[PDB]
Design a protein around this ligand. Structure first.
Ligand code: HEM
Lengths: 59, 101, 442, 49, 422, 54
């Protein structure tokens, strides 16, 4: 049972609850960003400079 | 020899709170201990201390002092609160130490 | 010396009768003594339609038997200088007698005649009806009670334990010679009874008297079956009975307890001893060791307060009750909860060491006389399955250390949703939410 | 009298687990709190972001 | 290994008494019994006794108000003062291994008090409370007033400081009261669960306020008046008595029995008392709920005896009257040779059970070692109780019907009768 | 005072106007705008300062 494990482990002791919120915000960010950019970019294929870039890059 | 006595009597006259008719103990800052102590003073000693002070305040507002004749004299200064004050502190130090125990 | 006085205490003899009943006793030098039957029956065993029977019965247990009506029965008891008393709780009824060690056997007969052959005179029932009805109206003015019942009423809402030992008003007004009869026949049975004796009596001469008046042997196996009770469910909630016209307010708060069996009850008690109790006439005043009592004095938080660890077969209530003026309820509750939280987080060895000595003197204090010693035996067997000597207890108590108290209290107190009972001018104490949040962070 | 008072029926509102008046609510306890606390802790992470 | 000890009872040169009895209980219970109380108070220092009782936790020359409580608590111990109008008892309980410790304070509280003005003044408003909780039981209201109407002095003095004197008692009144009454020859150091040798070693090489009888209680005169208190209560309490027997007076064993013959305190939960003539007789007379019993007090130089009735305000007349005829009818050979037989046991019984309590035992051992200096064996008191003739009893009943009565009643006295109407 | 929330000259302010503050049990959503307005204000002032800096 995860909810119980989570409760006793994380959410019970107010100190670890905050500790979870911190580490948890860290992971959440990293992933929420990646996914969203991924969504946004995919939604605009070949329209971004990131895309057309290759056509003029090369010394 | 009498060095400490000379000094004490000196500093006493140096401070000059007697010029206001205050006793040494009348000038103590009222911290927590002093506060309890005063509460234990006998009705009279307390009223006498009260007037003494209010007297000294009215002097300070007027920017005056007592005439030389009325100044409290080093050896006639009655340390009325110190006996009490020391007890208050004793009691506390006891309680204090006992609770760490 | 302590260490030994604990051993030289005469052991408690226990021998069961082939009919299910158990006989037990602690023999002393005492010329006088006490003996009675501790029945494992209560209001918990009652259903919703017979709520109060065990009490209506407690009332007729002395108004005569079949072998001897009222006048005779009473006369016979008084005239030998014996004191016949008893009671009835949620999970325990008991009828015991205080007499000279001599009458020991003629007493056992009496006890027996009471449980087995209660007259239940149709005419005595119509009287005990108006009588109970008054006791309900008198007890209705004892806030402390109106409060613990209300506590249970919500603590174990929707179950048996949520019931008053006196029962409803309808049940009092309608219970029949029948149900009463029934209740006795259904509950007052040997396998669920203990004949405890304390004083100057010979286990022998006692065990025999039982054999003689406690006959009725069982045929089937179901008669030897001690029925297990359907579990009572605890519920974090609150009931607030407001009447600003009351002088002072009552507040009782509690979490669910383990139940007789669980060894933690010991720790729990040590804990309760740390928080202790208080009332405006405690002379220690501002110097009392109990922090809650101290603040109570410093800030005039309450008229009185008490910690309690009410145990039951399979559950329990662990909490506190305070009586206070309408305008200090809040600070009081606040400081109290605080102390609880202090328990789960920072208890010192200094506190426990003392709490232990208080508990030790507390347990010994519960064996000051034949009645109290008999009560302990009657209940020990019935609840613990035997008797636990002061020597045993003392071991279990010296085992507790701060670290132990914190873990146990955290286990039962920390972050739990409690049951709350408030009666009177309770406007200042408020919000279950706020009280709930008081269940965590020292 | 107070003996005639009874705590109403909260079936309409009780959670699944603490609905049976004969089952220790203490077992589903850590479950019911762990959930709500999870929501909160989540809201905190969402906010922290 | 331990067995059966024997109750020693030494007495030093200064007349101080020591009464030890080892019973190998896992807990000791020491106490200091003293001849003091409201009885030695004068119009000048009333209530000073009461306060002295509450003043037990104040700083002593040896232990601080602080250490006295934290110290006795540190060892799961207790400390308390109980007192009559003529006796005071300072006792402390504790596990065996903590006797010596709990003793320091007991010793200090009773012999070396400091009664510091502030401590005292801070305490005084407490008499206001301790007294209010007590007066919650009307049972105690009629009794204060009874002793007043029944006397003119000593015992006529209230047990609880009168109102006007709250806050007016001095640290001096205390000391003087302590210097004058708490003197070696008026004190006894009893004690259960201890070896006599130690309790002795302590008493001598430790106690200081010495030798003497100090103040002498004024002989207790008898007034014979009636005090009435109209207060609205649905319940009227009444106590009609007459001079009883003194402590010791052989004439006491008589009333004690006449007491149990008239009935004194139910023995069956929610039951009617048939062995109680008074109860039974009053029951025939009234209709609604009530209670009536045999009241008996035995004081140094005096005593009280009569009945006490709690009844509804309306049926107060019939109840107190019935209570009377039932006392006269017994003052006229209305006592069976058997009633005397049944009572004789109930008394022997009651007596015996009274000593199961560590408090009860210590109180028995004490009272004797104080108002005598000896321990009357349990079989001696028995021989003394049953050696009471069917006459002695009927006679006691007469002394009541004949003597000058003094009543005391508090409730809606509207329908209650005046002493001169009985 | 026992808890430093009601005794402190400032925490007593935060507390006696946003924590132990007595509020009707039924005030609806149309009662949320007071705080929004407040918040709203604190935000304008913040964004504004940031802009005034350029
Ligand atoms: C009561 C709060 C405020 C209100 C109602 C408010 C409103 C406005 C409005 C209507 C404008 C024009 C915005 C546009 O459409 O371009 C503006 C501009 C500006 N405000 Fe505020 N303002 C507030 C507070 C502040 C404060 C406290 C500062 C900084 C001390 C500030 C600094 C500025 C600056 C620098 C501009 C010019 C930049 C721009 O045009 O956006 N404002 N403000």
């Amino acid at each position: 049972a995860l909810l119980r494990q989570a409760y006793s482990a994380l959410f019970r002791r107010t100190s670890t609850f905050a500790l979870t919120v911190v580490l948890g915000a860290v992971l959440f960010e990293r992933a929420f960003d990646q996914g969203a950019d991924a969504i946004f970019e995919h939604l605009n294929e070949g329209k971004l400079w990131k895309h057309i870039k290759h056509k003029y890059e090369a010394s | 020899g009498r060095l400490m006595d000379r000094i004490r009597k000196w500093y006493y006259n140096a401070a000059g709170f007697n010029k206001y008719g205050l006793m040494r103990d009348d000038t103590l800052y009222e911290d927590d201990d002093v506060k309890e102590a005063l509460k234990r003073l006998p009705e009279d000693l307390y009223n006498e201390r009260m007037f003494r002070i209010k007297r000294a305040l009215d002097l300070s507002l007027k920017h005056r002092i007592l005439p030389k004749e009325q100044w409290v004299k080093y050896e006639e200064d009655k340390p009325y609160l110190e006996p009490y004050l020391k007890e208050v502190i004793r009691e506390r130090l006891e309680r204090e130490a006992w609770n760490k125990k | 010396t302590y260490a030994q006085t604990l051993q030289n205490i005469p052991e408690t003899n226990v021998t069961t009768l082939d009919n299910g009943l158990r006989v037990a006793s602690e023999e002393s030098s005492q010329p006088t003594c006490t003996v009675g039957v501790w029945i494992g029956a209560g209001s918990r065993y009652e259903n919703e339609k017979n709520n109060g029977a065990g009490y209506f019965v407690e009332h007729l247990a002395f108004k005569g038997t079949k072998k001897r009506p009222c006048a005779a029965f009473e006369k016979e008891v008084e005239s030998m200088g014996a004191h016949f008393n008893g009671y009835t709780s949620r999970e325990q009824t008991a009828f015991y007698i205080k007499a000279l060690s001599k009458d020991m056997p003629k007493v056992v007969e009496l006890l027996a005649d009471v449980v087995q052959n209660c007259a239940l005179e149709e005419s005595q029932i119509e009287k005990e009806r108006g009588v109970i009805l008054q006791e309900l109206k008198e007890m209705d003015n004892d806030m402390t009670n109106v409060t613990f019942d209300y506590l249970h009423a919500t603590a174990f809402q929707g179950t048996a334990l949520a019931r008053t030992v006196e029962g409803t008003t309808e049940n009092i007004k309608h219970l029949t010679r029948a149900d009463l009869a029934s209740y006795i026949d259904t509950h007052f049975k040997a396998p669920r009874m203990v004949l405890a004796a304390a004083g100057g009596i010979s286990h022998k001469e006692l065990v025999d008297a039982a054999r003689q008046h406690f006959s009725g042997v069982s045929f089937t196996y179901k008669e030897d079956a001690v029925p297990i009770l359907p579990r009572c469910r605890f519920t974090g909630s609150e009931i607030r009975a407001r009447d600003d016209a009351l002088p002072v307010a009552h507040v009782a708060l509690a979490v669910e307890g383990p139940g007789w069996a669980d060894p933690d009850n010991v720790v729990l008690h040590v804990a309760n001893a740390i928080i202790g109790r208080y009332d405006r006439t405690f002379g220690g005043g501002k110097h009392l060791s109990s922090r809650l009592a101290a603040l109570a004095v410093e800030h005039k938080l309450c008229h009185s307060f008490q910690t309690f660890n009410t145990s039951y077969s399979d559950t329990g209530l662990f909490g506190f009750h305070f009586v206070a003026d309408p305008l200090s309820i809040d600070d009081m509750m606040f400081c109290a909860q605080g102390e609880w939280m202090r328990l789960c987080t920072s208890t010192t060895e200094s506190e426990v060491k003392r709490a232990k000595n208080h508990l030790r003197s507390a347990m010994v204090a519960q064996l000051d006389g034949t009645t109290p010693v008999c009560e302990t035996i009657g209940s020990h067997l019935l609840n613990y399955g035997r008797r636990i000597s002061l020597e045993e207890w003392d071991s279990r108590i010296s085992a507790v250390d701060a670290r132990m108290v914190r873990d146990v209290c955290s286990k039962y107190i920390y972050d739990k949703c409690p049951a709350l009972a408030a009666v009177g001018p309770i406007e200042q104490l408020l919000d279950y939410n706020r009280i709930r949040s008081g269940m965590y962070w020292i | 009298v107070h003996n005639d008072v009874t705590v109403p029926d909260f079936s309409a509102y009780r959670r699944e687990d603490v609905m049976d008046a004969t089952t220790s609510s203490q077992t589903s306890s850590e479950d019911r709190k762990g959930f709500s606390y999870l929501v909160t802790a989540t809201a905190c992470v969402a906010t922290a972001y | 290994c331990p067995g059966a000890e024997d109750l020693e009872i030494t007495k030093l040169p200064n007349g101080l008494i020591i009464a030890s009895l080892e019973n190998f209980s896992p807990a000791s219970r020491i106490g200091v019994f003293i001849k003091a109380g409201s009885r030695y108070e004068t119009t000048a220092n009333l209530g000073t006794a009461h306060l002295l009782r509450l003043a037990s936790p104040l700083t002593t020359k040896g232990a601080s108000s602080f250490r006295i409580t934290r110290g006795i608590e540190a060892v799961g111990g207790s400390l308390s003062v109980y007192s009559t109008r003529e006796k005071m008892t300072y006792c402390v309980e504790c596990l065996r291994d903590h006797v010596d410790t709990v003793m320091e304070y007991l010793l200090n509280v009773t012999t070396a008090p400091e009664f510091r003005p502030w401590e005292v003044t801070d305490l005084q408003p407490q008499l206001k409370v301790d007294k209010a909780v007590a007066f919650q039981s009307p049972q105690v209201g009629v009794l204060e007033n009874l002793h007043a109407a029944a006397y003119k002095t000593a015992l006529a003095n209230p047990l609880y400081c009168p109102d006007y004197r709250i806050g007016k008692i001095t640290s001096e009144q205390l000391h003087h009261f302590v210097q004058n009454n708490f003197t070696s020859a008026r004190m006894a150091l009893v004690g259960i669960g201890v070896k006599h040798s130690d309790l002795k070693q302590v008493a001598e090489q430790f106690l200081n306020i010495r030798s003497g009888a100090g103040t002498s209680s004024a002989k207790a005169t008898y007034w014979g008046g009636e005090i009435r208190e109209q207060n609205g209560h649905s319940l009227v309490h009444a106590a009609v008595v007459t001079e009883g027997a003194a402590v010791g007076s052989a004439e006491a064993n008589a009333f004690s029995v006449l007491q149990h013959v008239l009935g004194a305190g139910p023995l069956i939960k929610r039951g009617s008392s048939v062995t109680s003539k008074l109860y039974q007789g009053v029951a025939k007379a009234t209709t609604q709920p009530f209670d009536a019993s045999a009241f008996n007090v035995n004081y140094s130089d005096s005593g009280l005896f009569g009945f006490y009735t709690i009844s509804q305000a309306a049926h107060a007349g019939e109840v107190i009257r019935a209570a009377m005829n039932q006392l006269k009818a017994a003052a006229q050979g209305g006592v069976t040779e058997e009633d005397v037989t049944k009572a004789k046991n109930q008394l022997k019984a009651t007596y015996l059970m009274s000593v199961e309590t560590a408090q009860g035992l210590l109180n028995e051992i004490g009272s004797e070692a104080l108002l005598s200096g000896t321990h009357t064996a349990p079989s001696v008191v028995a021989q003394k109780i049953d050696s009471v003739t069917s006459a002695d009893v009927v006679n006691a009943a007469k002394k009541f019907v004949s003597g000058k009565k003094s009543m005391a009643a508090s409730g809606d006295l509207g329908s209650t009768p005046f002493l001169d109407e009985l | 005072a026992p808890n430093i929330r009601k005794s402190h000259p400032l925490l007593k302010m935060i507390n006696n106007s946003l924590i132990d503050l007595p509020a009707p049990s039924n005030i609806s959503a149309w009662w949320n705008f007071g705080s929004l307005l407040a918040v709203c204000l604190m935000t304008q002032i913040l964004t504004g300062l940031l802009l005034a800096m350029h």
